[PDB]
């Protein structure tokens, strides 16, 4: 409940300054948690909206791919698997600074060295396969955006949990412990002052008795 700090006037001042610093840090971290939880609510709303958008885009892209497959007369799965030597779509991580946290947000990137498509050598439904490829490219872009949103959500939630944990710890441990330590140190200093007062009172009584005896 109290620290083992030896009660002294310097120690009392240091611990009072520590209490002031802890209270300031408590207010600062509470306001930070409030700002980050407002941003967390915003991110959750965007997550729900992007989830609905993904639900729509996957359905429409799957319909486009099925139409392309029907036009070509066969599934393009084998050609797509054979054309998996290189990656044409890549995600580059960006440490975008949002509020006071370095949340990582993904940015989609593309390369021309993997421009080959499964429609090469198919012999049928080239336009349909190209349209399906474009639709799934847009779909992959949407999923990269949603993945950036979700990574920011996870990071921000973790930081909010840590910050709220620190705020509650300061409010219920550090402030009570430091306040109890201030009370104890002040009581010990008062006891020392009382003892010094008694010693000086005894000296004064002896001096007065000696003066009377003279």
């Amino acid at each position: 409940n109290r620290e083992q700090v030896f009660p002294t006037r310097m120690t009392l001042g240091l611990m009072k300054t520590k209490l002031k610093g802890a209270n300031q840090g408590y207010s600062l971290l509470k306001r930070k948690s409030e700002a980050l939880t407002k941003r967390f609510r915003d991110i959750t709303k965007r997550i729900d909206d992007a989830k609905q958008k993904m639900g729509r885009v996957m359905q429409t892209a799957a319909f486009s791919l099925a139409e392309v497959s029907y036009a070509t007369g066969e599934n393009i799965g084998y050609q797509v698997q054979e054309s998996v030597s290189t990656a044409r779509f890549k995600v580059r991580a960006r440490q975008e600074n949002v509020s006071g946290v370095y949340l990582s947000q993904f940015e989609s990137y593309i390369d021309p060295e993997i421009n080959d498509f499964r429609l090469t050598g198919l012999g049928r439904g080239g336009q349909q396969v190209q349209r399906a490829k474009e639709i799934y490219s847009r779909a992959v872009e949407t999923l990269v955006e949603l993945a950036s949103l979700q990574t920011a959500f996870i990071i921000l939630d973790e930081v909010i949990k840590v910050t709220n944990r620190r705020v509650n710890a300061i409010e219920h441990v550090i402030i009570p412990r430091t306040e109890n330590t201030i009370a104890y140190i002040n009581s010990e200093l008062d006891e020392l002052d009382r003892e010094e007062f008694y010693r000086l009172k005894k000296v004064q009584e002896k001096k007065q008795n000696e003066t009377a005896k003279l």
């Binding site: 959750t44 997550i47 729900d48 989830k51 993904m54 639900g55 996957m58 359905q59 892209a61 799957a62 791919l65 099925a66 599934n75 393009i76 799965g77 797509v80 698997q81 054309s83 998996v84 030597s85 290189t86 990656a87 044409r88 779509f89 890549k90 995600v91 580059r92 991580a93 990582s104 993904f106 990137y109 993997i114 498509f117 499964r118 396969v129 399906a132 490829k133 799934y136 490219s137 779909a139 992959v140 999923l143 990269v144 949603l146 993945a147 979700q150 990574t151 959500f153 996870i154 990071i155 939630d157 973790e158």
Partner: protein
């Protein structure tokens, strides 16, 4: 990280084919493996799916975003919930005759 520039899909055959056409992943010349680990929900095994997901979400994998269909991720929902790491992110893509349900979203369940 710099090496993280890769997208992994563990969805159904149709979704895997579509994302491969989009060009998500590449076949590693040294590892002789590709990020387009196509695996049907009805085929293979739940243990195999869990092992593939663990390999893609751990073992210093280069995948930035792990794409798992809601149907296939439901069978490995325990592993999905266990994957509490911030990265790589996981998404529950809808599958044919298997729409995405908000209750099945492991990451959205943290709200």
């Amino acid at each position: 990280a710099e090496k993280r520039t890769l997208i992994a899909v563990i969805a159904d055959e149709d979704t895997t084919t579509g994302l491969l056409l989009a060009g998500i992943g590449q076949i590693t010349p040294e590892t002789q493996e590709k990020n387009f680990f196509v695996y049907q929900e009805g085929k293979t095994t739940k243990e195999e799916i869990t092992d593939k997901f663990n390999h893609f979400t751990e073992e210093r994998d280069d995948i930035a975003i792990l794409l798992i269909n809601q149907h296939i991720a439901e069978n490995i929902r325990a592993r999905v919930d266990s994957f509490t790491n911030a990265f790589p992110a996981i998404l529950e893509i809808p599958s044919k005759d298997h729409p995405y349900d908000p209750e099945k979203d492991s990451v959205l369940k943290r709200v």
